């Protein structure tokens, strides 16, 4: 019936079950982690099966070395323990955890987490090849390991580690049209000018949702536009111990219209900022590692408050930029900021925690 995701440690003596690999943030609440950890032998019974969640900033290396990767910066950490179960749980086990404990024996112990909404959304960036940068991101990691205490020497062989994605969602607020007008006067125009207008239909868009951009142009100068341009280039900034202002144009389209002097022209253009169109590192920001296709473009970061975002992960912001290739003398352009976000009995089926891909 319903799907359940599980991952087993290489030492299969311990395993973890989850209800969903990706967690949605509603800008005021995050759905909790509703897992359960199973150990068949209790692992000699003198150990406590801690399950730790960490949200840490990254920079430099994924190779586990020290150069730059020393910036592993745990922005949040919790240490729920399962066996012994501690006095009373934080809210009763959900029905999913109950059915998991039914399908499994008595050797399965639940664990519950809650993530404050101030934490960054799970996003990672890969510089272009080789654009002088380093890999970085904000990953959420579950480490269910059995030990006698919290500070015991955790090791991979007997500890299962799996990664969660904290995507963000906000309501489709009927905000005002994000207008963007400009008027260009020329040195030789004798008071004439090129007019230009633009406006999105909506202010917020979900992944894969096409963007519609209004265009209005009226020409008063003696210069004709040869062709126009539309792009949704991504603005990504590494605000923690770096200044890398990545500027990759994730999606662009070309369409050749012409407007002579004393001519007016208005239209609407459709664009679709999509990751799978160009699955290249390209020095752009992702919501998850680009090795698997269950990821999309990084969701635009809401500043919120709480000491802004300088130490709280990397920011990404989108805006549609359109420009006119006038015959000879200008490249007048426009910018239209917006925000992009993630769109949002029978027995159980054990899906694997392997993030499928094409390679």
């Amino acid at each position, epitope marked *: 019936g319903t799907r359940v995701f599980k991952k087993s440690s290489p030492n299969c003596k311990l395993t973890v079950y989850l209800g969903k690999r990706d967690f949605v943030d509603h800008l005021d609440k995050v759905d909790p982690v509703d897992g359960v950890v199973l150990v068949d032998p209790d692992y000699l019974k003198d150990r406590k099966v801690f399950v730790t969640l960490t949200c840490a900033f990254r920079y430099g290396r994924e190779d586990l070395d020290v150069l730059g990767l020393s910036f592993r910066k745990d922005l949040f950490i919790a240490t729920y323990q399962a066996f012994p*179960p501690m006095p009373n749980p*934080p*809210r*009763p086990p959900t029905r999913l955890q*109950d059915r998991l404990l*039914k399908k499994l024996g008595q050797h*399965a*112990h639940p664990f519950f987490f809650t993530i404050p909404q101030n934490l960054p959304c799970s996003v990672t960036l890969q510089p272009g090849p080789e654009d002088t940068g380093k890999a970085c991101g904000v990953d959420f990691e579950i480490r269910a390991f059995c030990a006698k205490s919290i500070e015991e020497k955790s090791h991979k062989r007997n500890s299962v580690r799996l990664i969660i994605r904290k995507v963000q969602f906000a309501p489709e607020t009927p905000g005002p049209q994000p207008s963007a007008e400009t008027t260009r006067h020329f040195l030789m125009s004798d008071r004439r000018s090129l007019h230009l207008e633009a406006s999105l239909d909506k202010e917020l868009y979900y992944h894969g949702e096409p963007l519609n951009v209004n265009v209005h142009v009226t020409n008063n100068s003696a210069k004709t536009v040869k062709k126009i341009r539309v792009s949704v280039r991504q603005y990504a900034d590494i605000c923690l111990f770096s200044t890398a202002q990545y500027k990759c144009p994730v999606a662009q389209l070309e369409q050749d219209d012409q407007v002579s002097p004393s001519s007016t022209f208005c239209k609407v253009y459709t664009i679709t900022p999509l990751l799978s169109d160009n699955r290249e590192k390209r020095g752009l920001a992702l919501d998850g590692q680009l090795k698997h296709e269950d990821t999309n473009l990084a969701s635009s970061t809401i500043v919120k408050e709480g000491a802004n975002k300088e130490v709280l992960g990397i920011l990404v912001s989108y805006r549609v930029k359109v420009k006119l290739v006038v015959s000879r003398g200008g490249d007048v352009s426009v910018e239209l900021p917006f925000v992009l976000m993630h769109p949002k009995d029978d027995d159980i089926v054990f899906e694997d925690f392997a993030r499928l891909r094409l390679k």
Partner: antibody, heavy 125, light 106 residues
């Protein structure tokens, strides 16, 4: 400290009347545990009635009491009420308040660890 | 709801004997049962949970066992404490509970 589950409020009412059973709890947080009301007719086996969880607000009722009983949890007073309406002769049972256990050495699933003293609810003329 | 059956509903053994009580399930129950011992005119105390796990305040003499869809309770040695009525309970779901008719162990 010990969880002294205790209930009170039951009395005598002719059929079709109303009454509010109260279940005072202590020694544990109300949110983390389910509450079940289990009744017992005179000289008969127990019978489930209804259940509520304060944190989830998930109510459920037995078939015979599907639209006659109402169970509500008031976390402020650390108590869960069962407001009964349209009582009839068969509801002359004694009613208990029970709390599911979460862990002793495993995940006892619906074990009703702690029971109250029981309140008698007579329904007669 | 789930129909849960106990049999037989009346027994009699002497102090120091060994006793068996069987409770049957009309639907697949994933070992999610528990037995209650009710002294006359008292709140039913818990006996065992998960169909095999013991509970505090109960001597190790009680030991249930799941043998498929059926369920069963064993008492290695009957004592005066065991004069009561025993109730099998099914708890497959979260909010749904059902009890058996109970057995009067004279």
């Amino acid at each position: 400290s010990e969880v002294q589950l205790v209930e009170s409020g039951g009395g005598l009412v002719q059929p079709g009347g109303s009454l509010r059973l109260s279940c005072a709890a202590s020694g544990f947080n109300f949110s983390s545990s389910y509450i079940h009301w289990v009744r017992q007719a005179p000289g008969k086996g127990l019978e489930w009635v209804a259940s509520i969880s304060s944190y989830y607000g998930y109510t459920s009722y037995a078939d015979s009491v599907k639209g006659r009983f109402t169970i509500s949890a008031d976390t402020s007073k650390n108590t869960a009420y069962l407001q009964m309406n349209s009582l009839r002769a068969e509801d002359t049972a004694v009613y208990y308040c029970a709390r599911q256990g979460y862990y002793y050495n495993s995940y006892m699933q619906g074990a009703l660890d702690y029971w109250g003293q029981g309140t008698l609810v007579t329904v007669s003329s | 709801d789930i129909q849960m059956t106990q049999s037989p509903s009346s027994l009699s053994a002497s102090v120091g004997d060994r006793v068996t009580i069987t409770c049957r399930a009309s639907q697949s129950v994933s070992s999610a049962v528990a037995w209650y011992q009710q002294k006359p005119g008292k709140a039913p105390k818990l006996l065992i949970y998960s169909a095999s796990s013991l509970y505090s305040g109960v001597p190790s003499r009680f030991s249930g066992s799941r043998s498929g869809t059926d369920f069963t309770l064993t008492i290695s040695s009957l004592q005066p404490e065991d004069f009561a009525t025993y109730y099998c309970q099914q708890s497959k779901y979260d909010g749904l509970i059902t009890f058996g008719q109970g057995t009067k162990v004279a």
